[PDB]
């Protein structure tokens, strides 16, 4: 399904961040990294690199680099009236029996 012969440069990849994240935190930021002590003063070339780079997926990869689709389910246990419950089911009823 994924990966292209011409290169799947559509799903990108964040390598650089000024600090580690927090659980269930999404960071939508392509802002510049400051490797040098000198300010970049906008989009600059030396010691100012973008933190987002493209995967570039192709069908002809190995196991360790092939595109894998991942779905993560997380259950919460809040002290609230539960809205999702299991499909508990019944059997056929009986007549005039103890």
């Amino acid at each position: 399904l994924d990966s292209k012969p011409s290169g799947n440069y559509n799903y990108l990849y964040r390598l650089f961040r000024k600090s580690k994240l927090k659980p269930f935190e999404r960071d939508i930021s392509t802002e510049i990294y400051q490797a040098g002590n000198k300010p970049c003063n906008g989009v600059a070339g030396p010691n100012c690199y973008s933190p987002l780079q493209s995967y570039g997926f192709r069908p002809t990869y190995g196991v360790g680099h092939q595109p894998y689709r991942v779905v993560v389910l997380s259950f919460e246990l809040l002290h609230a009236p539960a809205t999702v419950c299991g499909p508990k089911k019944s059997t056929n009823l009986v007549k005039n029996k103890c």
Binding site: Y33, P46, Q53, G56, H65
Partner: protein, 594 residues
């Protein structure tokens, strides 16, 4: 934020973009080397040009980082390989002149065809024609004529180009903070910053030399033996005190003596062990060799290969359509893609080639966890050493017995052992003195202790005490004879084969002494030995992270350059060649007068 903290981020970003561009260039190289097509030619041009521009641009970005404040050794090595200026230190016109000199030397060597004999219609080719007609012949005069013709028509065209080539290389290496271009080639095997295991560039100058003084007698004995078997077929031209002319050394340049096996048989009644009939009997096609090879490799303990290797690698003939190259290559494209480019033939040498060419793949997949610049050997000699010890592990008759391609009633005796050792000494020992001579010659020409006025008289008097052969024709200064090799006319290092042999024998003795094997060293095998496989993967995994000076004793136990494993491999051959060479004089000397 110090220079190292920003340097590791720059290195990681470089590693990601460089592995992307390396995958692009390597897939281009694969689909050209499996399909000769002009669209793949323009793919060559675009991929190579963009990779060169990217490397130059990132090298200019990497030059601003000082290499003295950084403490982490991997960052040191990767930024040191990044800060190689290369040809960019020159002037633009000087760099263009040197690149055109290299390209036209490559085209002269590739297109050099002899047209001297008889009328100029008969122009015999170099690669399929000349090596074949010198490998199997019985005429002294034709060999002398072909030698003189090739050497003249290459040297007369290459000598002033070689002058400009040598001086440009010397001045650019003097401009790259080094002392010599020979020093630049010796800088490949460089280890600095490590206490206890320290190394240097010019150390390579002595690194072979003393060890060659420990390998000089045994080769001499082999040398004596071959002249003892080469005055039978060549009468009135050969003298034991003076040995024999250099055009009789198998190939064009004395690189291989494997072409003298038929004329230097140990004993002619029993042929060598062959398995071509046994392979063709049961129809072992093109893939069954690979399946049994990977079964043997996982019996060592090495991990399995991916499905992306089997469906993608070209494992048979290229066919009438889809022209390609029939050269053994172990292609590492990058992101988990491993391929073997080879044209499969029903041959024992094909089996050895296949084992040698996924030995490189099994070395490649181990340092894949290392970053992009550490995806190589810590020295250039580990790759072919690993491939050839994998080939030698499959070359034992015990492995052929266990693999099912041998009659179980067949037994091994001393004659088969000495025949195999004599055949292998035509392969191992054949390259080593030529390697040491040519590397030392190039080092001392580039250094400046050989003046411009004389290059070849010192070559002939210097060949006599190492290689020990006569000049076939009395030779002046005008020609350019030692530049007529593929590894010299294309600017390639040649000490890699010496390092390969004398480290692969260390690896062989270490593995088959760690595998609890009893017997001589030529019978060592790695079937059903998981601990030796784990200790092999220990040094395969490291790559360029640890220095090779440190990585040498991780499997062997020693740090310095060794010849004792080669002595232990060749000790029965050494003893019976001491026994056999009794009525024939030993040693070479300049008593021959032409």
């Amino acid at each position: 934020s110090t220079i190292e903290e920003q340097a590791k981020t720059f290195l990681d970003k470089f590693n990601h973009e460089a592995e992307d561009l390396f995958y692009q260039s390597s897939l281009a190289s694969w689909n050209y080397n499996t399909n000769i097509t002009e669209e793949n030619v323009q793919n060559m041009n675009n991929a190579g040009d963009k990779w060169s521009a990217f490397l130059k641009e990132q090298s200019t970005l990497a030059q601003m980082y000082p290499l003295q404040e950084i403490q982490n050794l991997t960052v040191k090595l990767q930024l040191q390989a990044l800060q190689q200026n290369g040809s960019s230190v020159l002037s633009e016109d000087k760099s263009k002149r040197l690149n055109t000199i290299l390209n036209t030397m490559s085209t002269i060597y590739s297109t050099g065809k002899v047209c001297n004999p008889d009328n100029p219609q008969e122009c015999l080719l170099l690669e399929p024609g000349l090596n074949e007609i010198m490998a199997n012949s019985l005429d002294y005069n034709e060999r002398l004529w072909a030698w003189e013709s090739w050497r003249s028509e290459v040297g007369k065209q290459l000598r002033p180009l070689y002058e400009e080539y040598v001086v440009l290389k010397n001045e650019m290496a003097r401009a790259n903070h080094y002392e010599d271009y020979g020093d630049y080639w010796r800088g490949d095997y460089e280890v600095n910053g490590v206490d206890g295991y320290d190394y240097s560039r010019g150390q390579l100058i002595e690194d072979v030399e003393h060890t060659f003084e420990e390998i000089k007698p045994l080769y001499e004995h082999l040398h004596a033996y071959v002249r003892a078997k080469l005055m039978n077929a060549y009468p009135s031209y050969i003298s034991p005190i003076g040995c024999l002319p250099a055009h009789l050394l198998g190939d064009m340049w004395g690189r291989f003596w494997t072409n003298l096996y038929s004329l230097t048989v140990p004993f002619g009644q029993k042929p060598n062990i062959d398995v071509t009939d046994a392979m063709v009997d049961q129809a072992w096609d093109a893939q069954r060799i690979f399946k049994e090879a990977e079964k043997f490799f996982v019996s060592v303990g090495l991990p399995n290969m991916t499905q992306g290797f089997w469906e993608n690698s070209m494992l048979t003939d290229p066919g009438n359509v889809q022209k390609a190259v029939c050269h053994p290559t172990a292609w590492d494209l990058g992101k988990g893609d491993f391929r073997i480019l080879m044209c499969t033939k029903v041959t024992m040498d094909d089996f050895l080639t296949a084992h040698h060419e996924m030995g490189h793949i099994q070395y490649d997949m181990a340092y894949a966890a290392q970053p992009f610049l550490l995806r190589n050997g810590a020295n250039e000699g580990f790759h072919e050493a690993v491939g050839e010890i994998m080939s030698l592990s499959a070359a034992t008759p015990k492995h052929l017995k266990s693999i099912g391609l041998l009659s179980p009633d067949f037994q091994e005796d001393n004659e088969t052992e000495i025949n195999f050792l004599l055949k292998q000494a035509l392969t191992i020992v054949g390259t080593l003195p030529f390697t040491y001579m040519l590397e030392k010659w190039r080092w001392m020409v580039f250094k400046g202790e050989i003046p411009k006025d004389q290059w070849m008289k010192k070559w002939w008097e210097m060949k006599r005490e190492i290689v020990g052969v006569v000049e076939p024709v009395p030779h002046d200064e005008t020609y350019c004879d030692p530049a007529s090799l593929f590894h010299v006319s294309n600017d390639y290092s040649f000490i890699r084969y010496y390092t390969r042999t004398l480290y692969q024998f260390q690896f062989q003795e270490a593995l088959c002494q760690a595998a609890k094997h009893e017997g001589p060293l030529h019978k060592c095998d790695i079937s059903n030995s998981t601990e030796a496989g784990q200790k092999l993967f220990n040094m395969l995994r490291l790559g360029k992270s640890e220095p090779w000076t440190l990585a040498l004793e991780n499997v062997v136990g020693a740090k310095n350059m060794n010849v004792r494993p080669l002595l232990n491999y060749f000790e029965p051959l050494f003893t019976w060649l001491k026994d056999q060479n009794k009525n024939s004089f030993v040693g070479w000397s300049t008593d021959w007068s032409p």
